[PDB]
Structure formats: structure tokens, C-alpha cells
Ligand binder design. Structure first.
Ligand SMILES: Cc1cc2nc3c(=O)[nH]c(=O)nc-3n(C[C@H](O)[C@H](O)[C@H](O)COP(=O)(O)O)c2cc1C
Ligand SMILES: Cc1cc2nc3c(=O)[nH]c(=O)nc-3n(C[C@H](O)[C@H](O)[C@H](O)COP(=O)(O)O)c2cc1C
Lengths: 223, 222
């Protein structure tokens, strides 16, 4: 494999996978992936990421604790919402994404109980055998969060290289106190979780094709 | 195989601080920026707006930045405050600075050499191109996280085509200058990425910045 071809395969090949098989990723592969991900750059080489990887019985207890917290409305999010977050084209993109996702799931926006069933499964990591919880410093702001994103993408691409499917999930960060309590983590903020393992390629949700805006919408070249 | 290629890309990408004058071919530049667009983001919002500057426009921009710095016209959209980094994060920052300044041959009390180096950084380290990464006006942690996902996708796509890069928060400290020179309004500047082909004879390009061990950043439980 030539480098240019490999980058295209990894970058386009990585997709948000929402249905996994139960098979675990070998421990040596997980070590190789997370070691590689640590090579992400960051402001001043600060490497602000603290990553909690959960498997087996601990992963099962964590999934049940998230389902229970969600049922009890114990929302404990570390990052507040900012008014007007998605205006204009950002809102159009979110609406189009939601439309494609629900169409692949075979659910209509008015089918509340089916949306509930789907979201309960999301808290069970879509059946993934592993989850990586991406913790950040208590004083995380835009620059540190940018580095958390550099790391998240490095990790997802290293996973893709090993045939490991992933789903980045902001949803898991909405129950940060539950994750911290389960894992014994103190004084860190939870930005997102990444469910991972091997994709169930028979699931219609994994057939969803999410477009991108393209150069004219995002990029300008000047000289 | 793909596993080896990922290792080569991820480990091969380094912050390059001395460039050759040679421009990236137009078709390669378009391929790299189109590929970077495949970065994921919350709800597929793709909040990035990227201004790629080359040639005379890049020269005018570099000179405007040098002038803004000399006149102390610092304009920051995202604060970079003292105490942003504490504990081990502050020590990693100090350790990085020590390695960089040793490669540059600049001592602690050398203000004139430090000024000359800062001027060269505002000239994009001689890179023929710079990508300015603009974010929405209301950017907070989650949107900034997506900007980082994009920035790393772009740097890795560049590395795959043998294109060296340096992500630079420094360029975001003169946000009004960048906006005025590029006709950009109502977007915040998070960082710039200088890019082109590495000058392999430059001592600064020999620096190798380590990472904390896997045991230091990651915990596995079952
Ligand atoms: C930081 C971040 C948070 C995300 N949060 C969720 C989430 O909570 N649940 C979910 O189903 N997908 C989530 N997504 C996945 C996307 O919606 C997805 O990346 C986008 O639709 C682009 O599709 P693709 O990744 O398949 O190319 C998240 C993506 C990112 C980068
Ligand atoms: C968001 C971001 C901002 C950065 N700002 C600068 C900068 O202003 N000037 C600079 O020389 N390097 C800057 N760096 C580059 C690093 O310091 C570098 O990525 C870190 O030391 C790790 O080294 P490596 O990328 O060579 O592996 C920045 C890196 C990132 C990811």
C-alpha cells in the first residue's frame, strides 16, 4: 500500500458504526492502537487526554449504570450548551444527518418509543465490547478541546487501520458523574466516549451514507 | 499493510519549522483539502472554514503579521492565559520548550534571538502555504473538538503526500489581522497550519519530541 492510497482508505474508510458484533479486540492490538494514538500532536506537547478504556464485566456494569442514570434523568454533563450552536448551514447539516440516520433505522421522528429503544442501545455502546472515555482537564476550553479532537481522530484512524470500527459519542459525556463513579476517576471532565470493536455489517444503520459539504462550502484558496 | 501505513503517517507527521520554497502542486492541494473534509463531526455539522493562502497573498499576509506583532496589536479570539496548563501538562510544555530551544540554539535570556525566531514563525517558517482554520463565532469546547478532528485529518492527508506541516496557535494571536487581509468576517480563528516541503538540512527539523508512555495517558479496566 502506497501512503497516499492508505490515507484515503483510512480517512474515507472510517465511519460512525452503530451496531457491533460481541467479539473482543485482542489485548495486544488494543495496546498497539492506543500507543499509536498517543502520537497525536497538541499545544506545547501537553497531551491533555486521559483515556479510560473499559471492557468485559466493567463495560457491562458501566452500560447498565448509564441506562439507569438516563432512566432517572441524572444528566451530569461537564460541557454546557452554547446558544445558537447550530445556525444556518450547520442546522441544515444536522437536520439532513438526523433524516438519513432515522431513515436507515426505519424510524419516524414521531415514533417516541422507537427513538427510546434506539437510544437505550446507544447507552449500551451499540453492543460494542469496548468503550474509550476521553477525559480532559477541569479547565478545558477551546484550545484544549481542539487537542482532544486531534487525539480522537488519531485514535479512530489507528482503529480503522486494524479493522476496528468505532462510534464517537457526545451522548456518553451527558452522564459524566456516572462514568467517573463507575471508573473511580476524579477531577477530570468527560468530553466524549468512543464505542469500539467489530462492526455488524448486516445492520441497516451501518449502511447509512453521510455526505460531506465539499470544497466550495468549506475551503478557499487565494494567491 | 494498512497497520504499517497508519504507523508511518501518524508517527511520520512532525511539526516542521523550516521549509523549502517549492509549492505543492494545485491538484495535490485540492486532493488533500477534499480528503480532510471527510473528518467526522457532531451531527455532521463540519464547522470548519479553511482559508488557504499562497503566493503574493501569502507574502502580504506574512508581512501584515510581522507588522502587527512589532506594533503589539495582539487580537485573540480564544484566550491563551497563564495557568491554562498546570501539573504534568505544564511540565510537558516546559520539556517541549527546552527541546525546541536547544535545537534552535537559543538560550533562556536571549530576547533578540527569541524575537528573530518569533518573526520567522509569523513568516510561516518560510512555508509557501498557510491554511487558516476558522471556526463559528459561538465556538465552545465541542465545536473546537471538531476543529481538532479536522486539523489532524488535514495534517495526516498532507503527510501521506510528503507534505510537511506545522500547526500554529501563534497565528491565532493576530486574528483581526488575518481576518482583514483575507476578507473574513464573523468567524473566529483557532490556528493556522503552515505547509509545504521540509528543509531537511535545518537543525530545527531534527528535533524529535517524545510522548508520555501509554501507562501515563491511558487506563484499561475490565
Ligand atoms: C465529537 C463527536 C461526537 C459525536 N456524537 C455522536 C453521538 O452522541 N451519537 C452518535 O450516534 N453519533 C455521534 N457522532 C457521530 C456522527 O454523527 C458522525 O461522525 C457524522 O454523522 C459523520 O458521519 P461518519 O462519521 O459516518 O462519516 C459524533 C461525532 C463526533 C466527531
Ligand atoms: C493546536 C496546536 C497549536 C500549536 N501551536 C504551535 C505554535 O504556535 N508554534 C509552534 O512552533 N508549534 C506549535 N504547535 C506544534 C507543537 O508544539 C507539536 O505538535 C508538539 O510539540 C508535538 O511535536 P510533534 O508535532 O513534532 O510530534 C502546535 C500544535 C498544535 C496541535
Amino acid at each position: 500500500v502506497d501512503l497516499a492510497q492508505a490515507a484515503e482508505r483510512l480517512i474515507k474508510g472510517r465511519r460512525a458504526v452503530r451496531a457491533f458484533r460481541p467479539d473482543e479486540v485482542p489485548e495486544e492490538t488494543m495496546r498497539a492502537v492506543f500507543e499509536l494514538a498517543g502520537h497525536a500532536p497538541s499545544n506545547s506537547n501537553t497531551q491533555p487526554w486521559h483515556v479510560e478504556v473499559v471492557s468485559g464485566a466493567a463495560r457491562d456494569r458501566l452500560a447498565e449504570a448509564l441506562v439507569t442514570a438516563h432512566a432517572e434523568e441524572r444528566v451530569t454533563v461537564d460541557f454546557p450548551y452554547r446558544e445558537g450552536l447550530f445556525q444556518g448551514v450547520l442546522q441544515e447539516r444536522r437536520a439532513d444527518f438526523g433524516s438519513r440516520l432515522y431513515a436507515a433505522l426505519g424510524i419516524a421522528r414521531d415514533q417516541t418509543d422507537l427513538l427510546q429503544g434506539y437510544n437505550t442501545e446507544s447507552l449500551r455502546f451499540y453492543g460494542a465490547p469496548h468503550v474509550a472515555m476521553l477525559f480532559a482537564p477541569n479547565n478545558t476550553e477551546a484550545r484544549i478541546a481542539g487537542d482532544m479532537g486531534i487525539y480522537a481522530q488519531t485514535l479512530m484512524l489507528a482503529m480503522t487501520a486494524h479493522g476496528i470500527a468505532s462510534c464517537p459519542q457526545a451522548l456518553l459525556s451527558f452522564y459524566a458523574d456516572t462514568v467517573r463513579a463507575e471508573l473511580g476517576v476524579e477531577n477530570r471532565k468527560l468530553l466524549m466516549g468512543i464505542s469500539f470493536g467489530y462492526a455488524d455489517d448486516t445492520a441497516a444503520v451501518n449502511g447509512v451514507r453521510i455526505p460531506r459539504a465539499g470544497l466550495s462550502e468549506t475551503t478557499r484558496f487565494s494567491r
